Structures are given as structure tokens and as C-alpha cells.
RNA sequence: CUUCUUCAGGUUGGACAGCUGG
């Protein structure tokens, strides 16, 4: 019922307020692609991870149990692998995952081994998408 | 009335339709010696990672470069029987295999020509009259094309873009393509009042004629002839039996202004509309061939042989 | 009684029966498919299948002409699919049901999701610009076991009704079920068709099952 | 002697019993379902379940056809559902009740509300233009535990009465309960059908349970 | 019993007048798109937000507790996240949210944490729907 | 008393005559749609408004105070909000409210804020419905 | 070496409305 972005992650609140703050900080100083360059993130570079997270959410919502099964754990491992791949592809997804502690959320969900942990992680992912589209987007 | 028409497509050259793009080797293995590329079964890949060296250790090294060839066999020294789904030969014919555009596939990994691809390839012919009637045009609202059927995984290959401007310059873009001489099955239907088979054939023939005598042959007699000849046969006047489907077909195949205006007007219109898109101090567009074994067999990119039959 | 027309809908190509973009996870595909609210399984609405089958059968029973209201169709169409006419209201003999995805175990063991994300774009001919498009479709090979209830209002006109039902099922074969069927999506293939008696037993049911399976 | 018929109604597909559509706040769905006023819980009215069960049972019991007024049904239908004739007033042996859904906690476990919104359109045939609409449905998987009171008036026909009751429940399982049933909605199922004695004991309650369970 | 908007205030009695003036301001100065195009918001555009508001209204009203529960507040925070997402998706929806005070009212409901504040928020959104359909409609 | 109906006021000796006159003017040259009319309003089109008015009348009639409480003024404000809702939901109700000034009477009650003003409004509404029937109906 | 992550169009219509008995 709680994972670690670095400070706290409660179901009741601040699962979207921390998305507020992460997106505001990203807009506060956007990533620098190169010394003589200007860069801004596009939501098309998160889409694979979003698809994987949504698929795992659909798989886990139909479970009357707390701990995620072994196949779901392999799916979360795949989610982390895809995070690494799509972060290494364009090194602005690297900045996006670093400043949002998204990989840290993945690791916390893996450690907790609880359904509500992944549900709150998915809620934070939805908050990140929502507040990125709100302030920025494109 | 609605009449169905089974459609068979044979790609004279390589045809590429994308479904995703991958950077340097992270999701696939490339043995540079044997010119063979292996795509890792990713779920078995993560199961193997869970069974062996830690996933964090594996993913701590994704900082560009980092080919899987020099990690699975060099840094770990392990064999990869389960980490394969299909193999694709590679055509390196001096810019390295930096990027690989994979062919579009369904959930099970089978390649297939997706929806709206053949629809656009037919719109680029039937739309010969005007650019206005596009959405409300009832011509294509009654045209009904289907998806491709089963395609063997063995019929895939990796090709590099080749140029025509005064030479054949290799390009860093490498893409996954179906090899030539591959049979593809489709199914197209349409209302008789709005469209007819002879109308489709006439549109295809007119498009190919304006492509060949005005652009292909015209651009050949304006740039060079002996550069193509390795083979570069490029047959023409084949009863309008040619359609260009897939990526790398050319900028001409995606725009309808050479077949609605004469040479000078269409040339100047293309130059003006493309200089807005791209800022290059260059000249008219050039062909986009490729090479394949060994000789440099020049094949026209996206060249497909389109034949139809009743029902 | 309540003859049950059973079978299976097999997706030859991807199917996109349009669900609401809302009422789902934030950040999902722009155009999603309709799903069961509880199980999140892809759904073939009974209303969509009924409407497509009625449109195809009424067109085929009117020599390929349909410019009239649904209540002004053929007598067989009106008796199978019901009518709201002021003069006489015909209770529909066919009762369609929402069809859930059924072969999720085999899709799980083949390591494929229930839905695939399709990559599409539209390119102008005046300008070589292609607008990206995101469309969700249920993957091909997805089975959909259904159960259509049939009413024996009259025993004389049951073989004709089931012949019309088979004709409607076969018309869906050479057509799409829902969504962007113009562009290759939604191809279906009925299989394992059969008719059973809900309560007790019905004579000459073998004749109906013979004209329904082939 | 009085008997209580326990059981659960499970929604196989979405159910839509038409609501008031004049008091469900402002900016709600176009066509709401009927709900309990206090708890805002969707319910199956006893009147609607009774009417559907009576129609199906009277149609199946008489000849398979039913065209008469409700007061001119068979003796079994009149003794089970009551009659208001002049000189033949049958007191109904069955007392139906409004059925609120009970598994709201189970539905909230899957993070889904009790009711969904179903998007439908009608395509005008002469124009080929769609007309989207929205309706509200109680989602499939909702459970409605009901209670029906049986007045044990004649000991000589309680077995036949309960055979008719089981038959009516079976007929409801091959039909729909309220709403756009022919268009995929309203399919229900019955299980845990057990009859218990309201006060005291019934010496043939074991035979009643086995005909109510099979 | 009293939700904040900024300079102006909304109570249990003046919610309708404030919703009416907010709607009238929108119709008097309709939102202009990028290509010089005036646009009017549709009920279907905010239908998901409205149903989320009504979904948690049903569970709030079946609770005789002054303080909102943790899960109810989680639902309300998710509603605010969805409001932000829909604002980021459509510029006209974002303009409608900004001209009204859906974000301000929802965050004041999160601040007050009380049952009556959310009920007045639901009253305000109902009045906004009513006056939106009164003038322009779908 | 002295309830303002926009043009001419009503009081305890007037409301029935003006209600009958408004209803008769409803039947003379009735509402016209975009497609040339030609239906009139029905009871099950303002039934919700009538039920709200009945509930508020029951609440007020059990209070002896000359001034309406804020808890009842909230109910009258919601009545006005709903009247705006079905007025915009269908134009057959909009002109019915306009010509038989429900909104003007509600505003005058919400301004006077007195028990007698709302009682006069309720009597006027009852007479309006009574004359709407026996002349039209449905 | 190139940018677009979706744009455009529909947004509910018709029917029934209380009838029998004391």
C-alpha cells in the first residue's frame, strides 16, 4: 500500500502530487541533448512501457490474491528490461525515468510482491502521463 | 453490387513495412562474421536473466553501443539456443548497422502486410483526378481491402538504402525487408457502381506510366545509365501490373502531382513543396535502389507485381 | 421452445469494435476496443453482431438495396430481429448476447496479449507529411464462443429461419464485424456452429443442425 | 406454513432495467438503470422479475403460445402469480421482492463500479450515417441474492408448484431480464436455489430442494 | 459548505449563480483554437470526468461521516488526475477547466478532506453542466 | 407576497388568473421546433422540477419562520439549476419556463428569501399545472 | 541529414401511458 519514489507514495494522495512535482521540475529545466542543443520529451517515447504496464495491470486486476504470480513477476522483469532498452535508445527517456524515479518504482514493486503495490505504481504511471500531457505533451 | 477479388502480390524487389524501430544491438544479436542477425525470444530472455546473472547487472550497460554479440558470447561466454525466434540475412552494401527497422508483425511474430497499406497503394492510383475528394469521396468508402495472409519467416532480409545521384552512396539506415520472389495473398472487394476492376487496372497503368516515362526513364536519361548496369532491369509497359508498396518506394509514389501536371510544372511544384520540408542545397530527387548477392544486383525498392482474379 | 444457436467467432484479422476512450487506464491507446468492465476481456457486443447480421441479411433479402428503416425490412428479417411497428409489434426470435474473449489460456501460453496495438498513419498527396495514428485491435486467432437463443414462435417457418441465420452468418464471412473493416480489420470466421434444445428435446433438430453446420 | 426461496441472480451480460431518468442528478447517463433510492444500489424490481417469469412460464405451460390477458392464464399460473377476475380471485402464492445487488464489495475488489456505460449507434440506412447513443448497464458478474416467499396453501400441489417455479427459473436463463435483451443485454443465471421454511419445519422440504436444484 | 475559487467564493447557496456566470463568460468569449477557430466544449469531452465524479458521489453519499475515508480521497485524487489528463489531451477542454474552477474546487475538496465540501463540489459541477447545456449544449 | 413574474407581479388574489392566462397563451400558437412544431410540453418533462418544488414546499411548510433558512435556499437554488438544466435539454421546456416564468419567480423567491414568497410561488406553480391540465394534459 | 503521436464527421430518434374490480 506504499512504495518509495524517494519520499513517499500513498494511495489517498500524493500519487499525483509527486507527478505534479516531477513534471514541473522537468519543465523547470528540460533535458540537454547536447551542449549546443535544446531538447524536449515526446510522449511517443514512453508508449512501449505504457503498453506493457497496461497489459500487466489487465492481467493482475483479475486476481483474488495479494502476491503476484511468477508469470506476472516475469512480466515486471520484462517491464524493467524494456525500460532499460527504451531509455538507452534515446537518452532523454533516460532523463525522464531518472527524474521520475520510475525504475525505482519498478524495483519497489518487485520487492514488495503485492498486488496493491503494482496498482499504486500503475496509478503513478497514469499520473505521470496525465501531468506530462497537461503541462507539456506533444 | 459488391464483387470480391482475391489478390496475389509478388514483391519484385524488397518491400518493407515498419512496425517498430530498434537502435544498436539491444533487442537482437548480430554476428558480423556470418552476416546473420538473430532476434532474441524476449520472454525467454527475461526468464534466462532471472535464472542467471542479475537483470540490474545486464541493464547497467545500456549507454549506446553495447552490442549483444559482445555480451552474450564475449563477456558472459554463453550460448543462445533459446534466445532466437527468427534469423535475417544482412546486406552491408560502409555505414555500419547502426539502426534496424523491423518489419510489422502481428502478436505471434508472423510478418504480414498490415491494413490500409494496400488501401493507400490503391488510393495513389485511383485518386489520379483531384486532391480535393479524399474523405467524403465515396469511391474508397466502398473499397474494402483485407490484411495479408500467412508469410514464412524465412522470407525476410536486411537491406541498406542505395542512392542514384551520380553514384550509389551507402546510407546508415538499415531496414528489414521481405526478399524478392515471395508470394503474398490479399482480398479486395468493392461496389460495382463506384469502382470496377478495369478502373483499378487503368489507374495502376496510368500511375506506372507517369512513374516510368516521366520519372524513372526521364530521370535515368537525365542523370546516368551505366551506373545501373548491376542488373537494374526495371521492366515497363506490363499491362499496368505493377504497384509500389512498402517503405523506401520513393517520394514520387507518395504524391500525386506528376500524373496531373506536365514535366516542368510538376518538377517545380515538387521542388517548392519539398524545400519547405527539407533544407538541402541539392537537385531533383533520385532513385532508391539496393544491393543483394556475389554481385550488386540492383533491385527497385518497393517494386511489387500486382495480379488480380475474380472472387 | 428455446433452441440455442452455439458456435465460435474466430478473428482472421485484427478486430476493432470501438469502445470508449474514457473509462480505462490513463495513457492507454487513443482508440481502444470495447471490453468487459469486470474481467477487462475484449468483448463482441451482442448489439453490434445483431446489427451487422441484420444489415447484411436485409441487404441480401432486398437484392442489395437498403435505404429503408429497420421496421420496413422483409418479413423473415422482422420476425428474426423484431419490430416496433405501430400496426403489429413482432417479438424477436433471435436473442443475441455479449461475447467475451474465450481463448485467453492459449493466448497466454503462446505469449501474446489479447489485444495488439496497430501502427497507422495518413499521408497527404499534396505534401509528403504522414500524420501518426494509434489504433487498438484484438489480435487475430482470438476465439469468441457465443450463444444465440432462438424462439420457436412457429414450427413451420423454422427451417427457413435457420437458413436465413446461416446465410447471415456466411455474409459476415465475406465482410467485417466492427470498426475499420474498410482497411482490413475485423475479419471473422464462424466455426463449430450447432443448434441445441434448451429444455427437453426437439424433433427434426438434426435437420436444423445439418443446414447450420454446412 | 410459509416458504422462502433463496438464490442468486448472476449477470452473464450487462443488465438494464429502465430507470426514472428524472431524479438521477444532473449530467448523468442518458438512460439510467433503476437503483435503490437510499443506497444508490442498482436493483432488480420484484415486479419486473415476476412479470418476465410469469410471461415465460405462462407461454411454456399453456401450449408454447400465449396471447390471452394475464387473468386468463392456466390454473397453475393463476395460483402462483394471482388473479383479479370477478368471481375467481386467486391469492398469489409467490411474493416477489426488490433485489438489490449484494457483491458491491466483490466488484470494488476489481476496482470497477457496479454500473458501466454502453456506447451504441444506429446507422441510418439511406444515409449511411451513425447516430451514437449511451446507455447504462449493470456490469456482468454482478450478483443479486433474492428472496421469494411461497404461501404453502395446498399440500397436494406444492411439488407441482415448485416444479413450475424451477421451470420458470430455467426459462429465464434462456431469455433476458429487462432492457435491450435481444441486443446482447439482460442475460442472467440462477444458482444456490434453495427453499427453506419461514417458521417451523416442512416434512417435504428435502424433495422441494432437489427439484429446485435439478 | 464553502469552496474557494481565488478572488471569488462559492457556498452552498450561490453555487448555481457562479456556475451560470462561469458558463456565460465562456459563451461570451468562446475559446479560439490555433487556426483562428472558435470551439465549444461537448458533454462527451468531459463525460469520463463527470462519471468519475458521480461514481465517488454515490459512495460518499452512502457515508454519514464528516471525514472522507482514505479510499474515497484516493478516488477523488484520481479524479483530479483524470481532469488534468483530459485537459492535456484537448486544448478546448483545458480552456473549459481553466475558465471554470474544476481544478481549484477539486483541490479544495482534497484540502478540506470533509464530506460536505465534496457534496458542494458535486453541486457546483452539476450546476456547471446544467448551465452549459442551458446556453450552448452539446 | 408581490411575487415578480418579470412583466407583471402576482399576489394572493392574482396567481390563478395569470396562471390560467399563461396556460391559455400556451395553447394559442404553441411551440414550434426546427421541423415546424408542433407538440406541447408533458408532465413527464418537468416532473423532476415539480418533485423538487414539492419537496421544498414540504420543507418550508413545516417551518414557522418568516425567513427561509440557508438549507432551504440551497434547495431553491438547486431547483433553479435544474430548471436551467431541462430548459437547455429540450426547447419545448425552455419556452414553457420562459412564458410561464418559473425562473423569474424562483429568482424573486431567492431575493425575498421569505416563507410567504415561496408559498405564493408554490401556489402559482400548482395553479399553473392545474390549468395546464384540463386544457392540455399528458 | 526530416517532422508530424492523430486530424476530420456524426452527439439519441420514434412508440406506449394507466386500464380493469369493489
Count CB pairs under 8 A between chains A and D.
Answer: 5
* Nearest residue: Cα versus C1' of G16: C86
Of B291, B302, B212, residue with least CA distance to B259:
B212
Give the ranges where chain E is alpha helix by DSSP (H): 15-28, 47-61, 70-89, 91-99, 102-112, 115-135
Sole residue written with cell 480552456: E95
d(C-alpha B175, C-alpha B157), whole Å = 8
Q: Is the dihedral of CA F87, F93, F99, F104 positive or negative?
A: negative
Of D73, D32, D31, D36, residue with least CA distance to D53: D73
Q: Does the beta-carbon distance from A11 to E88 stay under 8 Å?
A: no
- Among candidate residues B93, B49, B94, the one with its CA nearest the CA of residue B71: B49
Q: How many CB atoms lie within 10 A of CB F106?
A: 23
- 3-class SS of residue D43: strand
Pairwise CA distance, residues B241 & B237, whole Å: 9
D132 burial class (0-12, 13-18, 19+ CB within 10 angstroms)?
exposed
Q: Which nucleotide is nearest to B278 (CA to C1')?
A: G2
To one decimal, the resolution in angstroms is: 2.6
Burial classification of residue B279, based on how many CB atoms lie within 10 Å of its CB (0-12 exposed, 13-18 middle, 19 or more buried): exposed
d(CA D110, CA E34): 41
H/E stretch holding C147: strand C143-150
Question: In degrees, to the nearest 5, what angle opens at C-alpha B13 toward C-alphas B223 and C184?
Answer: 120
* β C183-184/B144-146 pair status: parallel
Does A have 3 or more CB contacts under 8 Å with F? Answer: no
How far are the Cα atoms of A88, C96, C169, C178, D124 from residue C51, in angstroms, in the given order?
A: 48, 10, 12, 10, 12
Phi, psi at residue B21, to the nearest 5°?
A: -125, 135
Partners of B28 in beta bridges? B39
D31 touches strand G (CB under 7 A): yes
Q: Which residue in D135, D190, D163 sits closest to D17, CA to CA?
A: D135
Q: Do A74 and B43 touch (CB under 8 A)?
A: yes
Cell of C205: 433438430
Cα atoms in the 13 Å half-sphere on the side-chain side of C57: 27
Helix (H, G, I), strand (E, B) or coil at D165: helix
A57 vs E contacts (CB less than 8 Å): none
- Burial class of residue A6 in the structure, from the number of CB atoms within 10 Å of its CB (0-12 exposed, 13-18 middle, 19+ buried): exposed
Residue nearest to nucleotide G4 (CA to C1'): C131
Protein residue nearest nucleotide G12, by CA to C1': D133
SS3 label, residue B238: coil
Separation of alpha carbons C154 and C161, rounded Å: 10
Angle at alpha carbon of residue B105, lines to B100 and B110, rounded to 5°: 115
How far is E89 from chain F, CA to nearest CA, in Å? 27
Give the count of beta carbons closer than 10 Å to the beta carbon of residue C106.
12
Q: How far is CA C9 from the centre of its chain?
A: 8
CB–CB contact A54 C39 (8 Å): no
The reply to whether omega before B72 is within 30° of 0 (cis) is no
List of E strands, B106-229: 144-146, 156-160, 173-178, 183-191
Selection from B176, B121, B175 nearest residue B148 by Cα: B121
- Which chain D residue lies closest to A63 (C-alpha atoms)? D110
- Using DSSP's 3-state secondary structure scheme, residue D79 falls into helix
Cβ density class A63-102: b for 16+ within 10 Å, e for less: eeeeebeeebbbbbbbbbbbbbbbbbbbebbbbbbeebbb
CB D190 within 8 A of CB D172: yes
Cell numbers placing B193: 457502381
Q: Is the CB of C84 under 7 A from strand G?
A: yes
Query: Which residue on chain C is closest to D168 by alpha carbon?
Result: C199
The owner of cell 463500479 is D113
- Annotate B283-307 with b (16+ C-beta within 10 A) or e (fewer): eebbbbbbbbeeebbbbbbbbbbbe
Contacts of range A112-116, beta carbons closer than 8 Å, 24 or more positions apart:
A112/A3, A113/A67, A113/A68, A113/A73, A114/A1, A114/A66, A114/A67, A114/A68, A115/A60, A115/A63, A115/A65, A115/A66, A115/A67, A115/A68, A116/A1, A116/A11, A116/A66
Residue E9 φ/ψ, nearest 5 degrees: -130, 150
Phi, psi of D155 (to 5 degrees): -70, -15
Which of F71, F78, F89 faces E133 most closely, judged by CB atoms? F89
Cα(C13)–Cα(C189) distance, integer angstroms:
10
CA E2 – CA A91 distance, rounded (Å): 48
Q: What's CA B186's distance to the chain center, in Å?
A: 17
Cα–Cα distance, E87 to E99 (Å, whole number)? 12
Alpha-carbon span D112 to D139, nearest angstrom:
9
Cβ neighbours of residue C64 closer than 8 Å, sequence gap 6 or more? B1, B2
Q: Is F9 helix (H, G, I), strand (E, B) or coil?
A: coil
Sign of the dihedral through C-alpha E57, E59, E65, E67: negative
**Cβ(B86)–Cβ(B46) under 8 Å?**
no
Rounded Cα–Cα distance for residues E10 and F44 (Å): 32
Give the span between the Cα atoms of E62 and D124, in whole angstroms: 43
What lies within 8 Å, CB to CB, of E106 at 6+ separation is E76, E79, E80, E83, E121
Question: Which residues on chain D are in Cβ contact (under 8 Å) with A119?
Answer: 111
* Cα(A126)–Cα(C27) distance, integer angstroms: 6
Residues facing B10 on adjacent strands? B183, B305
**What's the full length of chain B, in residues?**
311
Q: Which of F15, F18, F29, F39 is nearest to F90 (CA)?
A: F39
- B126, burial (CB in 10 Å: exposed 0-12, middle 13-18, buried 19+): buried
Grid coordinates given for D173: 436463463
3-state secondary structure at position B295: coil
Nearest-Cα distance to chain B for C185, in Å, is: 7
Q: Among partner residues C18, C92, C198, which is closest to D182 by beta-carbon distance?
A: C92
Is the separation of the CB atoms in D170 and D26 below 8 Å?
A: no
Distance, in Å, from the CA atom of B104 to the CA atom of E13, rounded to the nearest integer, reads: 59
**Distance of alpha carbon E110 from alpha carbon E3, whole angstroms:** 11
Among residues 31-70 of chain F, which lie with CB inside 8 Å of chain E?
70
CA distance D116 to D42: 11
H-assigned helices in F28-69: 43-61
Residue that has been written with the C-alpha cell 546510407 in this structure: B171
Contact B311, B6 (CB under 8 A): yes
Residues F106/F79, Cβ–Cβ less than 8 Å: yes
- CA at C120, C1' at G8: how many angstroms apart? 16
Helix (H) or strand (E) run with residue C120 in it:
strand C115-123
E51 Cβ contact partners less than 8 Å away, ≥ 6 residues apart? C22, C23, D29, D117
The distance (Å) linking the CA of C97 with the C1' of G22 is 46
Q: How far apart are CA A103 and CA A95, in angstroms?
A: 11
SS3 content of chain C, % helix, strand, coil (to 5): 25, 30, 45
Chain G positions with an atom below 7 A of a protein C-beta are 1-15, 17-18, 20-21
Nucleotide G2: closest residue by CA–C1': B278
Nearest residue for G8, CA–C1': B135
* Helix-strand-coil split of chain F, %, nearest 5: 65, 5, 30
Residues F85, D22: C-beta atoms closer than 8 Å? no
CB atoms within 10 A of CB B269: 16
Q: How far is the CA of D81 from the C1' of G21 (A)?
A: 17
Gap from D160 CA to G19 C1', in Å?
A: 32
What's the length of chain A? 138
- How many Å does it take to go from CA A6 to C1' G7? 40
Q: Residue B55: list chain A partners with CB under 8 A.
A: 77, 80-81
State the nearest residue by CA to the C1' of G11.
Answer: D132
Q: Are strands B303-308 and B242-244 parallel, antiparallel or unpaired?
A: antiparallel
Which residues does A120 contact at the CB level (< 8 Å), separation at least 6?
A1, A2, A3, A9, A11, A15
Q: Does D214 touch chain C (CB under 8 A)?
A: no
Number of H helices, E strands in chain C: 5, 9
| Cβ-Cβ contacts under 8 Å, C22 against chain E | 47-48, 51
Q: How far apart are CA C36 and CA D116, in angstroms?
A: 9
Beta strand ranges found along D101-203 (DSSP E): 115-124, 129-138, 143-151, 183-184, 188-197
Q: Which residue has the least CA–C1' distance to nucleotide G14? A: C84
Dist CA B154 CA B149 (whole Å): 15
Cα distance between residue C103 and residue D174, in whole Å = 24
Q: How far apart are CA B238 and CA B209, in angstroms?
A: 10
Bridge-partner residues for F67, per DSSP? F114
SS3 label, residue C44: strand
Listed residue (C49, C180, C146, C41) closest to C101, CA to CA:
C41
- Spatial distance between the Cα atoms of E120 and E114, rounded to a whole number of angstroms: 11
User: How many whole angstroms separate alpha carbon A32 and alpha carbon A27?
Assistant: 12
**Could you tell me if C192 lies within 8 Å of chain E, comparing CB atoms?**
no
Long-range contacts of F109-116 (CB under 8 A, 24+ apart): F109/F3, F109/F76, F110/F73, F110/F76, F110/F77, F110/F80, F112/F3, F113/F67, F113/F68, F113/F73, F114/F66, F114/F67, F114/F68, F115/F60, F115/F63, F115/F65, F115/F66, F115/F67, F115/F68, F116/F1, F116/F66
Q: Angle at Cα F95 formed by Cα F91 and Cα F99, nearest 5°?
A: 175
| Number of CB atoms found within 10 A of residue E134's CB | 22
Q: Which three cell numbers stand for residue B210?
A: 507517369
The angle at the Cα of C210, spanning C208 to C212, to the nearest 5 degrees, equals 70
Judged by CB atoms closer than 8 Å, whether chains meet at C26 and A130 is answered as yes
Q: Which residues contact A51 (CB under 8 A, 6 or more apart)?
A: C29, C117
F138 CB closer than 7 A to any strand G atom: yes
User: Which residues of chain C have a CB within 8 Å of the CB of E47?
Assistant: 22
Tell me phi and psi for residue B303, to 5 degrees. -75, 120
Tell me the residue ranges of DSSP E strands in D20-98.
43-44, 94-95
Q: Do D27 and E126 touch (CB under 8 A)?
A: yes
Residue B151 three-state SS: coil
Interchain CB distance below 8 Å, F74 and E127: no
Residue D46 CB neighbours (<10 A): 17
Instruction: Determine the Cα–Cα distance for residues C67 and C60; give it in Å rounded to an integer.
Output: 13
DSSP conformational letter for B154: G
Sequence-ordered list of residues with C-beta below 8 angstroms from that of A98, at least 6 positions apart, any chain:
none
Residues 91-130 on chain D lying near strand G, CB distance under 7 A: 121-122, 129-130
Tell me which chains share at least 3 CB pairs under 8 Å with chain B. A, C
| Chain D nearest CA to C69, separation (Å) | 7
**From the candidates F44, F48, F53, F93, which should be mutated to test the interface with D, based on the most D CB atoms within 10 A?**
F48
Closest nucleotide (C1' vs CA) to C129 is G4
CA distances from D206 to D149, D157, D194, D195, D209 (A): 17, 15, 10, 9, 5
Per the CB < 8 Å rule, is F81 touching D26? yes
Indicate the SS3 state at residue B11. strand
Q: Which of B57, B62, B70 is CA-nearest to residue B30?
A: B70
DSSP alpha helices (H): ranges in chain A?
17-28, 47-61, 70-89, 93-100, 102-112, 115-135
Interface residue of C26, C38, C121 to substitute, partner A, most A CBs within 10 Å: C26
For residue F8, give how far its alpha carbon lies from the nearest alpha carbon of chain D (Å): 31
Sort residue E6 into left (φ over 0), alpha (ψ -120 to 50) or beta. Answer: left
Which residue shows C-alpha cell 408533458? F42
**Sign (positive/negative) of CA torsion A100, A101, A107, A112?**
negative
Asked if residue D44 lies in contact with residue D146, where contact means CB atoms within 8 angstroms, the answer is: yes
Report the alpha-carbon distance of residue C104 to residue C108 in Å, rounded: 6
Q: Between A and C, how many CB-CB pairs are < 8 A?
A: 29
Integer distance in angstroms from CA A79 to C1' G16?
57
Instruction: Check CB contact of C68 with chain D, cutoff 8 Å.
Output: yes
* Strand G contact at CB of residue C130, distance < 7 A: yes
Give the closest nucleotide to D120 (alpha carbon vs C1'): G12
What is the C-alpha radius of gyration for chain F, rounded to an integer number of angstroms? 15
Contacts of F123 (CB under 8 A, 6+ apart): F12, F15
In sequence order, the 6+-apart residues with CB closer than 8 A to the CB of C95 are C148, C149, C150, C151, D175, D176, D181, D182
Amino acid at each position: 500500500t506504499e512504495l518509495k519514489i524517494g519520499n513517499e507514495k500513498v494511495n489517498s494522495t500524493n500519487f499525483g502530487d509527486f507527478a505534479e512535482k516531477a513534471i514541473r521540475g522537468i519543465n523547470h529545466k528540460p533535458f540537454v541533448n547536447s551542449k549546443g542543443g535544446e531538447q524536449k520529451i515526446t510522449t511517443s517515447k514512453i508508449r512501449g512501457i505504457l503498453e506493457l504496464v497496461n497489459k500487466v495491470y489487465n492481467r493482475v486486476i483479475n486476481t483474488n490474491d495479494v502476491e503476484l504470480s511468477e508469470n506476472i513477476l516475469a512480466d515486471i522483469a520484462y517491464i524493467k528490461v524494456k525500460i532499460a532498452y527504451e531509455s538507452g535508445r534515446e537518452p532523454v527517456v533516460k532523463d525522464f525515468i531518472q527524474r521520475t524515479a520510475f525504475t525505482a518504482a519498478i524495483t519497489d514493486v518487485m520487492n514488495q510482491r503485492t498486488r496493491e503495490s503494482f496498482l499504486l505504481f500503475a496509478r503513478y504511471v497514469e499520473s505521470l502521463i496525465a501531468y506530462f500531457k497537461f503541462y507539456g505533451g506533444k | 453490387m459488391k464483387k470480391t477479388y482475391r489478390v496475389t502480390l509478388t514483391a519484385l524487389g524488397p518491400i518493407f513495412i515498419g512496425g517498430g524501430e530498434k537502435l544498436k544491438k539491444y533487442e537482437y544479436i548480430f554476428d558480423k562474421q556470418k552476416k546473420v542477425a538473430h532476434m532474441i525470444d524476449h520472454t525467454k530472455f527475461t526468464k534466462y536473466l532471472l535464472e542467471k546473472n542479475l537483470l540490474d547487472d545486464f541493464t547497467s550497460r545500456v549507454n549506446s553501443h553495447f552490442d549483444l554479440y559482445d555480451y552474450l558470447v564475449n563477456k558472459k561466454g554463453i550460448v543462445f539456443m533459446p534466445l532466437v525466434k527468427y534469423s535475417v540475412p544482412v546486406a552491408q552494401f560502409s555505414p555500419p548497422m547502426n539502426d534496424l527497422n523491423t518489419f510489422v508483425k502481428d502478436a505471434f511474430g508472423r510478418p504480414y502486410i498490415p491494413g490500409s497499406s494496400l488501401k493507400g497503394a490503391l488510393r495513389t492510383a485511383i485518386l489520379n483526378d483531384l486532391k480535393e475528394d479524399t474523405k467524403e469521396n465515396e469511391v474508397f468508402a466502398h473499397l474494402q481491402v483485407s490484411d495479408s495472409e500467412t508469410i514464412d519467416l524465412e522470407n525476410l532480409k536486411v537491406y541498406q538504402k542505395v542512392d542514384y545521384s551520380k553514384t550509389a552512396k551507402p546510407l546508415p539506415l538499415y531496414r528489414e525487408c521481405l526478399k524478392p520472389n515471395t508470394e503474398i495473398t490479399f482480398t479486395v472487394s468493392f461496389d460495382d457502381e463506384y469502382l470496377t476492376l478495369k478502373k483499378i487496372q487503368n489507374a495502376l497503368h496510368k500511375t506506372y506510366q507517369h512513374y516510368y516515362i516521366k520519372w524513372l526513364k526521364g530521370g535515368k536519361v537525365g542523370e546516368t545509365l551505366i551506373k545501373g548496369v548491376f542488373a537494374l532491369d526495371q521492366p515497363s509497359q506490363n499491362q499496368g501490373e505493377i504497384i509500389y508498396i512498402g517503405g523506401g518506394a520513393g517520394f514520387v509514389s507518395k504524391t500525386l502531382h506528376y500524373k496531373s501536371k506536365n514535366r516542368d510544372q510538376a518538377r517545380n511544384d515538387s521542388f517548392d513543396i519539398l524545400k519547405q520540408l527539407f533544407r538541402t542545397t541539392y537537385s531533383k530527387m533520385r532513385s532508391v535502389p539496393d544491393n543483394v548477392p556475389t554481385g550488386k544486383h540492383y533491385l527497385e525498392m518497393g517494386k511489387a507485381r500486382i495480379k488480380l482474379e475474380e472472387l | 421452445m428455446k433452441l440455442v444457436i452455439e458456435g465460435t467467432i474466430v478473428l482472421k484479422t485484427g478486430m476493432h469494435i470501438g469502445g470508449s476512450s474514457d473509462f480505462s487506464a490513463i495513457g492507454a491507446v487513443d482508440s481502444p476496443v470495447v471490453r468487459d468492465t469486470l474481467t477487462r476481456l475484449p468483448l463482441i457486443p451482442g448489439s453490434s453482431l445483431k446489427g451487422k447480421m441484420r444489415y447484411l441479411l436485409a441487404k441480401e433479402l432486398n437484392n442489395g438495396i437498403l435505404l429503408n428503416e429497420p421496421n420496413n425490412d422483409q418479413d423473415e428479417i422482422l420476425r428474426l430481429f423484431g419490430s416496433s411497428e405501430k400496426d403489429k409489434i413482432r417479438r424477436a426470435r433471435l436473442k443475441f448476447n455479449d461475447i467475451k474473449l474465450s481463448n485467453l489460456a492459449e493466448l497466454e501460453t503462446f505469449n501474446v496479449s489479447s489485444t495488439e496495438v496497430k501502427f497507422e498513419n495518413t499521408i497527404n498527396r499534396k505534401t509528403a507529411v504522414a500524420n501518426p495514428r494509434q489504433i487498438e485491435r484484438v489480435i487475430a486467432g482470438s476465439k469468441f464462443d457465443f450463444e444465440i437463443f432462438y424462439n420457436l414462435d412457429d414450427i413451420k417457418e423454422v427451417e427457413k429461419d435457420f437458413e436465413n441465420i446461416k446465410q447471415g452468418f456466411d455474409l459476415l464471412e465475406f465482410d467485417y464485424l466492427g470498426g475499420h473493416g474498410t482497411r482490413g480489420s475485423g475479419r471473422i470466421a464462424f466455426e463449430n456452429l450447432s443448434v441445441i434444445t434448451a429444455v427437453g428435446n426437439f424433433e427434426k433438430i438434426n435437420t436444423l443442425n445439418e443446414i447450420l453446420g454446412a
